[PDB]
Design a protein around this nucleic acid. Structure first.
Ligand SMILES: [Mg+2]
Ligand SMILES: [Mg+2]
Ligand SMILES: [Mg+2]
Ligand SMILES: [Mg+2]
Ligand SMILES: [Zn+2]
Ligand SMILES: [Zn+2]
Lengths: 365, 163, 365, 163
DNA sequence: CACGTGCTAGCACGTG
DNA sequence: TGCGAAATTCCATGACA
DNA sequence: ATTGTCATGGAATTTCGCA
DNA sequence: CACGTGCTAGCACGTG
DNA sequence: TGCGAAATTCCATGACA
DNA sequence: ATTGTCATGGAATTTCGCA
């Protein structure tokens, strides 16, 4: 009873005066629309709000309502949110109700061999002793090379890519942080040929979207071609590769082969418009196609999204949570905002993690 | 009639035997007639059997209208005739003993032969591993007659490894 | 060359006259904006469209474009879609681009014990030798009973529910087609007490939404309470049950306990508004609450949804497809339309399946 | 003062020993003071130990303000006093030898005792399994004084099994 | 050898 | 031109994960 | 230090054949 | 014992 | 009434699965 | 023969204390 001046008819900021505050049982009470409620001294409030919340680690409203049953004081929700921001278990176990910011649509690599995207499809049902496919997709064209491997290992990746680079050498190769790609042996191999390695953020396959999306197309065709037949895919990759490389993208009106070369080879339903032009007049037209390719814009932001700001408190989706374990790490801080969707955080362990915002939620309160 | 283009004709021949480079005795030279672009496949024999292994890889990338070659065993066999026809590739043969191509191909086939022979005695019995470089080299070479590189002509853009 | 009258300047319906149709190589050709194209006799068309499509089992446009390279004829896409509707592999492997119709929001069970929803949470990390939780949620109130079991078996379900029915007996018990619930032994048990068994459609946990959603709430609290402690959940179910049953639903402004009884028991932050009323005046107010509970309406349909119609051709999502195997069954027919979201189909095996539309796609063409 | 309500007082006592029904010798009678609602828990002894096992289940559903009982061992122990206080349940005791409740509870406790004894000799040493029915029966019985059933009073709605 | 990162398996129940 | 049919383009949905 | 994608097929819409 | 239905595990790589 | 602050309600997002 | 759900916390909005 520190602010008890109310009992003697004094005014205290925040406390409505049209109500009457009396004393019974040894408690300061209030006559209210809801009923008669109890007003605890400021000191006892933190404790009460805690007790109520801890009953079921309830969010804002559910916590307030519990307290409403016995008590009233000014701005209870302000005292309530204070606690919710302080409950370690709620902060690290609750879901977020804020969507990621709208997706970036990176510029299509300018020329063939500006960027490779690589990934492994597998494991698959054994064929000729093989279990995986290394899928190399060129970013500009979409052209795709498929290599069967017995394992998703640096060993095999190097083995495959040496064959591929006989043709040409890429500026950049993008990949997910799959062991075989984040090896030192591979960084070596890349360095020796002067290729920059660029890696997707972890647990975020959208980044390698190009390959992943090409994977679908590879699986879809494989499947169709293996209907009602044992799944022996090895002998088919060669066919799927040629097929898919020579298949028109409706929005672009072009085939990866075309975008790579400007003319069809001796594949069936071969195009032959540029048949009367010289190779020189043909190769120029290509440059013109490659520049005026359709490109999507970023879709409109969700009504209830968020974008990361430096110094913001932000938590990382736990990689692979055990059963009955919390799905979010202890709160961290935004250091760099590499773009509206990528972030460098102070990792909980505690390093610099470059993470996608998809694996982030803004910390509440 | 209608201007020379890529994939209009692929010129093939074998080169060997050479020193046993990690088990590989021969090399299948494939050269695009118009870009001069060159693919090099190390093989263990100048057999139809391995001409197929290798040209399968290549024809999984792009497919020529015509293959031109000498009347070597590997090229005049049934199997190879049947393999060509399966894919609608016309086989064209140089008359025996008097070999032929175009100007461009003849020169490129020379370069390969020498560029191969030099980086054969300088870097001795270990040529296998170096084939990928020879290939890039060859394809990044400047054509005297045409103002461009085989890479440039084929892909239509500056290579990221100029030579 | 059946319709070759064009070569002699005759008109044939569908063939533009402003163009000129000549003959070279032994083929009927046409001078076109695109270039010079070839017109095959009607008989050769089915075959061509097939050949093109089969290259990569391409959809409409991608197939058309391939053919465009060499050929033209009137309404090629009409001949193209004909084939796509006839390619078994494409029909059973391709994804759908039509969304489900908007969800139904079933009426909240009128009274307590009208409906039970049941499900098993588990397996969990062993506690006192227990591995599963049987979760019984009453549909009207949300009141939830939690039973620890060593297995998700009829045996254990019966064992648990006998204890539960000591209190009261439900009209209906809803569950998923989990073995323990679709047993004969359980149908027996249910029959003996005159409870109707109602089952969710297969591979569709939304149907048991009430339980499933309560599961989340159960796991969330369990987790919070087990932070930084070994996962021994057994001794906690009792606490979670009381906690959760006594926790306000913000939209309803009521706790499952309240909705069940009308007054709080001796739990902390006990409500006491209805303290001055008689039990009779208290129990009436309850009836009034139970009727005027907030209820959501069905959300607006997606721009590109569909609703099932009797006699429609419709395919069922393959339960658990092996790797590189098609994700859809051979096309079937709608028999009954139980509601805009539930369907009885002629099962591919071939029975009457009551399936959710979520596991259905409308057959293309 | 303020009208009788559910969970205001729970009346407990033990009944037994009885014939060993699948190993269970006793029964813990719990009766809500105002609805007359009855819970029946079969136990192996009139011990604090098992009074707790059973009342834990019950208090996981709803929790009385007060428990009223006789001065039986199981009820006057420390453990039970400590168990009651942990949950803020006040313990009220009838003075020894002169038992007391309200009118309503006294009658219900009679019914249970007889309804138990009848479906004990009619259906002999197998009473365990039947307890759930006795319970439904009891709770669906009509109250002479009040125009309603214990079920009706507690849940506020017609039972789906009337008796 | 546990750990981080990429992937797809697997086991339990009741029933024929 | 203007009108009806045909062609072409729009696009949200889903699967890679 | 990095970032989603594109085949697909009904529906919307623009182009075309012919006056 | 394979099958349908409900659930969550698991193994492979390179690296410390 | 009218205005500023406080309270209460709106709701889309995600997790059960 | 059956059918999604609701806790959640910033943002939108309605109610309240006081003139
Ligand atoms: Mg992948
Ligand atoms: Mg030779
Ligand atoms: Mg479940
Ligand atoms: Mg006694
Ligand atoms: Zn909390
Ligand atoms: Zn097809």
């Amino acid at each position: 009873a520190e602010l008890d001046q109310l009992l003697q008819g004094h005014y205290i900021k925040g406390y409505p005066k049209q109500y009457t505050y009396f004393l019974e049982d040894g408690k300061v009470k209030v006559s209210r629309p809801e009923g008669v409620k109890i007003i605890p001294p400021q000191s006892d409030r933190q404790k009460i709000v805690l007790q109520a919340h801890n009953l079921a680690h309830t969010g804002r409203e559910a916590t307030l309502l519990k307290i409403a049953n016995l008590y009233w004081w000014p701005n209870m929700r302000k005292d309530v949110v204070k606690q919710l921001g302080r409950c370690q278990q709620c902060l690290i176990t609750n879901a977020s109700n804020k969507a990621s910011g709208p997706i970036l649509r990176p510029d299509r690599p300018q020329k063939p061999f500006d960027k490779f995207f690589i990934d492994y499809i597998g494991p698959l049902p054994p064929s000729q002793g093989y279990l995986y496919v290394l899928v190399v997709v060129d970013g500009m064209t979409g052209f795709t090379w498929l290599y069967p491997t017995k394992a998703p290992s640096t060993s095999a990746t190097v083995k495959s890519l040496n064959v591929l680079t006989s043709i040409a050498i890429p500026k950049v190769i993008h990949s997910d942080q799959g062991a075989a790609f984040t090896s030192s042996t591979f960084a070596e191999w890349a360095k020796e040929r002067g290729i920059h390695l660029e890696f997707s953020t972890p647990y975020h396959p959208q980044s390698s979207g190009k390959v992943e999306r090409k994977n679908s197309d590879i699986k879809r065709l494989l499947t169709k071609l293996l209907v009602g037949r044992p799944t022996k895919w090895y002998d088919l990759l060669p066919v799927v590769q040629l097929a898919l490389n020579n298949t028109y993208s409706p929005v672009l009106k072009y085939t990866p082969h075309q975008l790579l070369f400007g003319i069809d080879s001796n594949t069936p339903f071969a195009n032959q418009d540029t048949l009367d032009l010289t190779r020189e007049e043909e190769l120029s037209l290509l440059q013109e196609i490659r520049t005026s390719l359709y490109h999507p814009s970023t879709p409109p932001a969700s009504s209830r999204s968020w974008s990361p700001v430096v110094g913001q408190l932000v938590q990382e989706r736990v990689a692979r949570p055990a059963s009955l374990r919390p799905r979010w790490h202890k709160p961290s801080t935004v250091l760099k905002v590499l773009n509206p969707r990528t972030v460098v955080i102070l990792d909980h362990l505690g390093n610099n993690r470059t993470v996608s915002i998809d694996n982030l939620k803004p910390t509440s309160h | 009639d209608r201007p020379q283009k890529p994939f209009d004709k692929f010129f093939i021949d074998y080169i060997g035997p050479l020193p046993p480079s990690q088990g590989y005795l021969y090399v299948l030279v494939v050269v695009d007639g118009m870009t001069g672009f060159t693919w090099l496949y190390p093989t263990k024999a100048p057999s139809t059997s391995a001409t197929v292994k290798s040209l399968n890889v290549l024809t999984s990338i792009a497919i020529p209208k015509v293959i031109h070659s000498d009347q070597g065993a590997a090229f005049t066999s049934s199997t190879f005739a049947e393999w060509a026809k399966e894919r609608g590739i016309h086989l064209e043969f140089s008359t025996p003993y008097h070999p032929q191509s175009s100007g461009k191909v003849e020169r490129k086939n020379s370069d390969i032969k020498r560029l191969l022979t030099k980086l054969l005695v300088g870097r001795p019995t270990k040529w296998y591993d170096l084939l990928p470089v020879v290939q890039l080299a060859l394809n990044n070479t400047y054509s005297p007659v045409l103002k461009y590189t085989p890479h440039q002509l084929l892909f239509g853009i500056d290579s990221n490894t100029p030579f």
